[PDB]
Amino acid sequence: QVQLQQSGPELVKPGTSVKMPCKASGYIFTDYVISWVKQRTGQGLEWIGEIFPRSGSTYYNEKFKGKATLTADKSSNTAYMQLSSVTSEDSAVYFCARDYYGTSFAMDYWGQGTSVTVSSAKTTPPSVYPLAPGSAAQTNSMVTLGCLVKGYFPEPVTVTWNSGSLSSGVHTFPAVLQSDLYTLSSSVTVPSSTWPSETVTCNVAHPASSTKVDKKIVPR
């Protein structure tokens, strides 16, 4: 099948440049144009520009002239986009697309997207804190516990509860930046019986800082 494969998330310091691939497979690379598209987290799609792979020829949206340079490498079937002197305004997910055959001018095959975060911040292991209620629960129903990952950079962390068994009634929340450090939180609700009778452990992993932290929920 037709496939476009883009690389994983990149963290880059302001002022530098970032060059990202879109590797093509399953069709004649030279026949179709490759479009590039930007998306800031929670925001809309923005067209960067198109490249004609055999030709080498490019068209840009005014706004990205000077910021984005698109290339092709026929021998690799790999398209590249490079952004120069990056500011945090270039932090975003960037997609490549192949335009469909015909006069269609529509984008039927998409890459997965490559994530760019621009920041002068530095690797920081998360601080995990177990979140226990203040007073004991009444007899009935369910009790909600928590875990609060604070102080990490860059994204992401992965929170799970009791090594993944507990999937029902979890809510891990989107991270929010606080002065170069992310803080997020997870909640877990459980039967009033199981806590504090049983053990509850949040498992917070940060691939970026080489850190895994298993932390147990204690009531007092």
């Binding site: 479009s35 598209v37 809309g44 799609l45 923005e46 067209w47 198109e50 068209y59 949206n61 005014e62 997609f95 469909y100 006069t103 269609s104 001018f105 529509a106 984008m107 039927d108 998409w110 890459g111 997965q112 997207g113 601080s127 804190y129 177990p130 979140l131 226990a132 209620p133 203040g134 007073s135 909600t144 928590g146 609060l148 604070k150 809510h171 929340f173 989107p174 991270a175 929010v176 606080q178 803080t183 997020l184 939180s185 909640s187 609700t189 007092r220």
Partner: protein, 219 residues
């Protein structure tokens, strides 16, 4: 410079219902030669790359259901979804391809469900955090509909504005609800100084707000 304008920015409807949205061009996207409008429609689900639904104003790509129906011409185009399902939760983008390419700002689509009031829970800071130099109080306003919610902090009964950080999930796929983490953040001293902490939550489900609280004194 063909600009695209989309409306409404955000929408809710209940399952099995039908919904419609407009994309508006700043130029004619028909061509005299060919007699086709260069406007397509995309659907983007969370954590996913966009997916083309319709091209040439009105042509479904393979596997696009009949419920999805794009239409219009010239400058006024419209996407339409009938028997809307839980799996149609997405943002929907139009895109002009007459000259270069330009995307609409999008329309967000959320499932409607029965108004449920949030289950609230408050949590004092942790020993380990207290030790380190800080002190955070966290509130959870879990599993509620509608999306619009007012959180409210009180220390010894007097509202607190500064030091508060909120984070929201997108609509849950399964249970069609939203949830929220409100985090009041303090210092050791200030936290240890006052005594009772309160989370207040006003949601159209109730005129009197939902209140949870803890007194530091107890344990």
């Amino acid at each position: 410079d063909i600009v695209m304008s989309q409306s409404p920015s955000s929408l809710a409807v209940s399952a099995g219902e039908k919904v419609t949205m407009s994309c508006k061009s700043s130029q004619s996207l028909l061509n005299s030669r060919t007699r086709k409008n260069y406007l397509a429609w995309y659907q983007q689900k969370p954590g996913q790359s966009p997916k083309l639904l319709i091209y040439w104003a009105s042509t479904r790509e393979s596997g696009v259901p009949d419920r999805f129906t794009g239409s219009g011409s010239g400058t006024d185009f419209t996407l339409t979804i009938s028997s809307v399902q839980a799996e149609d939760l997405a943002v929907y983008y139009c895109k002009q391809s007459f000259y270069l390419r330009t995307f609409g700002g999008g329309t967000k689509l959320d499932i409607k469900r029965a108004d449920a009031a949030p289950t609230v829970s408050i949590f004092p800071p942790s020993s380990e955090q207290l030790t380190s130099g800080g002190a955070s109080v966290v509130c959870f306003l879990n599993n509620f509909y509608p999306k619009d919610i007012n959180v409210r902090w009180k220390i010894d009964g007097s509202e607190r504005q500064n030091g508060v950080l909120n984070s929201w999930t997108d609509q849950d796929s399964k249970d069609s609800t939203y949830s929220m983490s409100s985090t009041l953040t303090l210092t050791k001293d200030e936290y240890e100084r006052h005594n009772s902490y309160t989370c207040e939550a006003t949601h159209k489900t109730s005129t009197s707000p939902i209140v949870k609280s803890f007194n530091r004194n107890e344990c």
